[PDB]
Amino acid sequence: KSDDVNGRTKMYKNIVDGNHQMEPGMPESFNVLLKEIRSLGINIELED
Amino acid sequence: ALASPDMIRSWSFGEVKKPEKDYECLCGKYKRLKHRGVICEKCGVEVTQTKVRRERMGHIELASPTAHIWFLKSLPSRIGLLLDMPLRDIERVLILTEEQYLDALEEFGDEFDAKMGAEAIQALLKSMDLEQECEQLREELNETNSETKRKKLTKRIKLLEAFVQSGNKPEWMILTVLPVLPPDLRPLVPLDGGRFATSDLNDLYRRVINRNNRLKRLLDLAAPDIIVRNEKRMLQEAVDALLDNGRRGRAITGSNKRPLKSLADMIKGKQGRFRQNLLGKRVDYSGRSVITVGPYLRLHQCGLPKKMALELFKPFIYGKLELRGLATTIKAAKKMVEREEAVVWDILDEVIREHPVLLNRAPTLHRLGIQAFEPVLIEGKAIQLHPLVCAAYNADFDGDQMAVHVPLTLEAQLEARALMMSTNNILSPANGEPIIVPSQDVVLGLYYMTRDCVNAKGEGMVLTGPKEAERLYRSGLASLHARVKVRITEYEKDANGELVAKTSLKDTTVGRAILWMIVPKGLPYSIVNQALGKKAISKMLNTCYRILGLKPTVIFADQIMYTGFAYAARSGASVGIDDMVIPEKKHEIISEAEAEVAEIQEQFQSGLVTAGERYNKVIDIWAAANDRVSKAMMDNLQTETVINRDGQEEKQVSFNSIYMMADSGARGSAAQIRQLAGMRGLMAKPDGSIIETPITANFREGLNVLQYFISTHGARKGLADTALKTANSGYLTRRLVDVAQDLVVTEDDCGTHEGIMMTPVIEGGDVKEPLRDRVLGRVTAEDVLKPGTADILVPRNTLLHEQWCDLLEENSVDAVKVRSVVSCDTDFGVCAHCYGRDLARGHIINKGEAIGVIAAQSIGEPGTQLTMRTFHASRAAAESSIQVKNKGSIKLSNVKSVVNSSGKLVITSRNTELKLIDEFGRTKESYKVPYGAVLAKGDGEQVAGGETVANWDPHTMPVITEVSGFVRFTDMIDGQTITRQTDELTGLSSLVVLDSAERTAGGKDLRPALKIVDAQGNDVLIPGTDMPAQYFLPGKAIVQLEDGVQISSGDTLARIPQESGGTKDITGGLPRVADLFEARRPKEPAILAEISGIVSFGKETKGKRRLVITPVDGSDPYEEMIPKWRQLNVFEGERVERGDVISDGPEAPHDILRLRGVHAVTRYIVNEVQDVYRLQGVKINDKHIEVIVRQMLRKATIVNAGSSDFLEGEQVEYSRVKIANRELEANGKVGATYSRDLLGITKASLATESFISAASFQETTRVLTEAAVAGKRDELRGLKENVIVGRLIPAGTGYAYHQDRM
Amino acid sequence: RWYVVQAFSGFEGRVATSLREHIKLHNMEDLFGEVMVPTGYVLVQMVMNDASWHLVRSVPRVMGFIGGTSDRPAPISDKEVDAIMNRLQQKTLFEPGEMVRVNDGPFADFNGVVEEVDYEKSRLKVSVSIFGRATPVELDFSQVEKA
């Protein structure tokens, strides 16, 4: 409930009823770490 | 990896030649979610979209040359390393000074030609490789032999030890394609709300676009190199401003953007990319709130407001209203919400008990910030809370913001009410003492009732128990009284098994006796109310929580507040002028202070004292009366009652206004109170020194104009002191935690049974530190007390009970074996039995727990406590002569004994310590011994209280003979070595031996030596060793006695004068501790002995750093380097052992560690670190300081050769595991030792195994590029990387999952 | 002082360097301190003079200077303050070939000559000068003023 808007919105689905349990994936703000370095002229891509 | 033309083009969607919605069509007739799977006519456009914009890097932009910056301009180079270049040329083309190069170019003719632009980095790597340096670079070295032959063979092995992770091409350094950020991450900051002025992130990226066309068009239209190369300079000017903005001058100078805003300034604007990334910020269901008080509420409660609670807890509010059937759906409720309703309140009274609240201050540093509380219903805006917990955070409620956190889900809700609450956390994680300790209105009220009161209405009417409190509440009979006996029904759990023991009548006061029935069974009762609760209120709750447990001890502490406040009001004291009484003799001690100074001030005008000491004598004489006026105050205040108690004429303790603030212990101190009262505190000049004269009047009385100037001169310092320290502590809080970071409990237990011994410091005089506080919660390995039986067990616990067992019985045993964080088998994380057990509820909390963060935070807040230490004679009587205050008997350790002429014992050896032992067994007073010591009484002989033990002339450092005989002046010629010097008044022609520097160019080998020889002819031998009784005299030595004098076994031969004398330096709180954290070498560093054996002296005083000694007998005769400036503490002709103080100065960490061992330096840190805060008044426990050190001691230079890299840099976690696996399975010899490389807070924390984490804390200018350049792959399981990329930290419950997962 | 050099998108940046290209050819010192490339609009730091204007007239023709007048950039008060001063000066007498100052619609802050004078329809087809050219539009006797 901050960096992910959509992480809030798939949890807006999960909270109200009382089902619970978590799934994040990737934390969005840290793609700006990756991207600003990508634009710096360095290579970053999620391989493996 | 890095980025070259092809691979950036895979991010690049179709060129940006010029800088100039979701589910709809262009023209806007296929608006909304209508139709969708259809194409529009005019535009040829779909409705069906998706969400990618951020992922896609729009721009291409192909420059006719290149640039980059990280690789052009940064303190450790890459283009400079791969080519063999400086940065200065890669700066100016496309070590000496500028004018030196221009003159060197002017001298070395032509030559020259000229270099080139950016292509002279681009084309360079078109014949450059990685996996191919390894057959070439050392063939140049192989020409001028040898060494490097093996360096390739090692690096060949290093490459052959892959091929999983590898080093990638240096063509990726340089950008034929210049990449740009995506659309969404660069928006216009609006000025009004629709005009959209130039952004902080596109002006320079308009320039990247501007740069490519200008060259691509003038190559077409033909332009000169004056117009072409300058465009390549101007290609570098912004493409070198675009990715970095540092070290040069570029772009717009303060119009809309203040700096310039680069990708370097977006990753490193101030201190990394925490704010956006790591920190996440802001959050859903968040609140900021102010202040109240809260008495009617509980300590396990939270007095929330009306309005803010509804706004935050929305999703469940409706979640109720919808599904139950209160509101029709989600929606008829909105109209009811928009208008505010009475029914809503009633429904939400139910959830408040089921869902807690997590609350904090604006600054939090400890584990006392995020303490959480159960919400309770209140109809008042400002948030009510407990009064105890305010002391834990440390706020005096005068504008302190209290932020709110969210207690949602079910899984997250567990950790609130189970881990860190008020309902849970009570006792200290850091200290052994309580944190739940009151201040002001609590403390006071209790004493205000519990006091030896003067008479009162009553005299003494006896009462049973239940009848008590009331009769004294009812009428006539006050609440205080003093002296009433009671049938107090007490209980004492003796011999293990519930409430044993019976009733008793005991003497107390009466406010005391009122309380002693609330009593739920346990404590001493009445024994403890007697005397006072001064620091004992905290110490009582200690003994509550130490004896009883968790179930009963909550009941005890609660009342201390609620009733202790009720006790504060009922007294109803005062803040008046007449409440406090200054001594009537003002014109006496002040005029005495005036006259005593005026006596010296006449010695100024006339001439009797010296100008420098004149200030000091005037100050000391003024300052003598300052303590006298303060003492005259304290005596004419405290012990002044005079009242008649039935039989008349009796003295009591005066219980007036501020006494019962101070005695009780509300806050602060007595030196504070004195100001209001008598003498004003003296504030120094801006430099540091103090003027002759002081202030003479009182804060209470009428004062003067120019008396307030000097107080503001210092008040300004004190304000900046209180303000700027928030920064330094804020750094120091971070720094320590930013060394620890990932160092935590895992696994079970330590296998090895070795550790560091526990003693007291035993500092100089009286007991500064006892044994009792040290052992608290520290596991035993073997530990043998008594004379060889059992006592202490192999794994059992040193909690609270076995302490009083080992501390009331068997007091003679001072030294006991104890474990440590270093002293374990498993190296990744650390083993549980090693540490200690300092915590809250039950002793020893669960497996898998933080530790490293406990210490670093619990040193975080006391980083505010220290104050840099605020501006903080050589008399031959009390200091040269050692004096003992108490009755006992002397005991020594490591000493050799000889009998004198008269009948005395004399000290010769160096490493010697006094240790007094009394009737019980423990050590009280113990002074460190300087050179030359005649004792009055030896070992075994009894010593009474108030006695002089050893006496000396401090001006001299004497030389004493061991065996009787005659003095023979061997190699003693007058002129070369000795000149006959007559003294001033007495006229003793004392033979003065001069220095080695003053002696002739030839006369160097001649040494002054006195040979002890008997009458019979043959030389005197020492009774023991092979060597004869012969001594050597140093330079500047005043020898009194001449040739042919009888000297027995124990007399003064020669007078070695004083060595500097009186080095008053003062140690800092915050600044030295910071210097100790970072671990700096001493400003005047001492020389220390290398290896065990006989030290000598050798070589001559010519040119260089004089005197070059070979010392250390047998093998290892290493010739050392001495600097001259110092006085030789260590005599040369001596067995100067491993770790001996050779010269005057402080302790250098590098020579304490690399020469000595484990047990030594850790103490020299810990003890001195234990000194710095403890000198002012901080409990810096043994377990938690060492956490600093036990993490630092890891990096090591490799010793032996094998699979490890010979003498390179490796951690403890690689080293120990590698050694261990080699022993009895794999390979014996390759079993290589590791010599220690031990650093400070900065340099050690640099080594992260994580490449996500390193690329955040450090200069991200370098490290994000470093993790990229080195092709480093994360694959870690620590606390650093998981906070960042949205992965799970092993923390608390996490550990239980991480034990099953990994 | 700051003068806005209007240039043409695509070669708008080209003009900003074409400043600095031609600066070195006509060279001495001063005048041009810090050339800003903000982007049809190129903001350029300059104190007023005859030099550099001759240079712009030697290499055109897409756009020139911006502000109030092309000879001397860059003021800020256009024609509304002129429409306040016309009130003290005062006619509804309009004929072919008289200057008919507009101050209503999107043709405000602009002047023009009346082309067609209709008395039956009560309109004045006033030709407002925009883009180095003319724009003929019907504006009421009040929507304009006699110069």
From Swiss-Prot, chain A:
Family recorded in the similarity comment: Belongs to the RNA polymerase beta chain family.
Assembly information from the UniProt record: The RNAP catalytic core consists of 2 alpha, 1 beta, 1 beta' and 1 omega subunit. When a sigma factor is associated with the core the holoenzyme is formed, which can initiate transcription.
Function: DNA-dependent RNA polymerase catalyzes the transcription of DNA into RNA using the four ribonucleoside triphosphates as substrates.
Protein name in the entry: DNA-directed RNA polymerase subunit beta
Organism of derivation: Escherichia coli O45:K1 (strain S88 / ExPEC)
From Swiss-Prot, chain B:
Keywords: Acetylation, DNA-directed RNA polymerase, Magnesium, Metal-binding, Nucleotidyltransferase, Transcription, Transferase, Zinc
Pfam families linked: RNA_pol_Rpb1_1, RNA_pol_Rpb1_2, RNA_pol_Rpb1_3, RNA_pol_Rpb1_4, RNA_pol_Rpb1_5
Single GO MF annotation: zinc ion binding
Entry binding sites for Zn(2+) 1: C25, C27, C40, C43
Binding site for Zn(2+) 2: C750, C824, C831, C834
Cofactor: binding details: Binds 1 Mg(2+) ion per subunit. Binds 2 Zn(2+) ions per subunit.
EC number, as in UniProt: 2.7.7.6
GO BP terms in the entry: DNA-templated transcription
Gene Ontology CC terms: DNA-directed RNA polymerase complex
Complex and partners: The RNAP catalytic core consists of 2 alpha, 1 beta, 1 beta' and 1 omega subunit. When a sigma factor is associated with the core the holoenzyme is formed, which can initiate transcription.
Function: DNA-dependent RNA polymerase catalyzes the transcription of DNA into RNA using the four ribonucleoside triphosphates as substrates.
Sequence similarity: Belongs to the RNA polymerase beta' chain family.
UniProt protein name: DNA-directed RNA polymerase subunit beta'
Natural source organism: Escherichia coli O157:H7
UniProtKB/Swiss-Prot annotation, chain C:
GO CC aspect terms: cytosol
Organism domain of life: Bacteria
Residue span, KOW domain: 96-127
SUPFAM superfamilies: N-utilization substance G protein NusG, N-terminal domain, Translation proteins SH3-like domain
Protein name stated in the entry: Transcription termination/antitermination protein NusG
Record-linked CDD domains: KOW_NusG, NGN_Bact_1
GO biological process, any: transcription elongation-coupled chromatin remodeling
Annotated organism of origin: Escherichia coli O157:H7
Keyword annotations from UniProtKB, A to Z: Transcription, Transcription antitermination, Transcription regulation, Transcription termination
Function field: Participates in transcription elongation, termination and antitermination. In the absence of Rho, increases the rate of transcription elongation by the RNA polymerase (RNAP), probably by partially suppressing pausing. In the presence of Rho, modulates most Rho-dependent termination events by interacting with the RNAP to render the complex more susceptible to the termination activity of Rho. May be required to overcome a kinetic limitation of Rho to function at certain terminators. Also involved in ribosomal RNA transcriptional antitermination.
Binding partners and assembly: Monomer. Interacts with the transcription termination factor Rho and with RNA polymerase.
Family listed: Belongs to the NusG family.
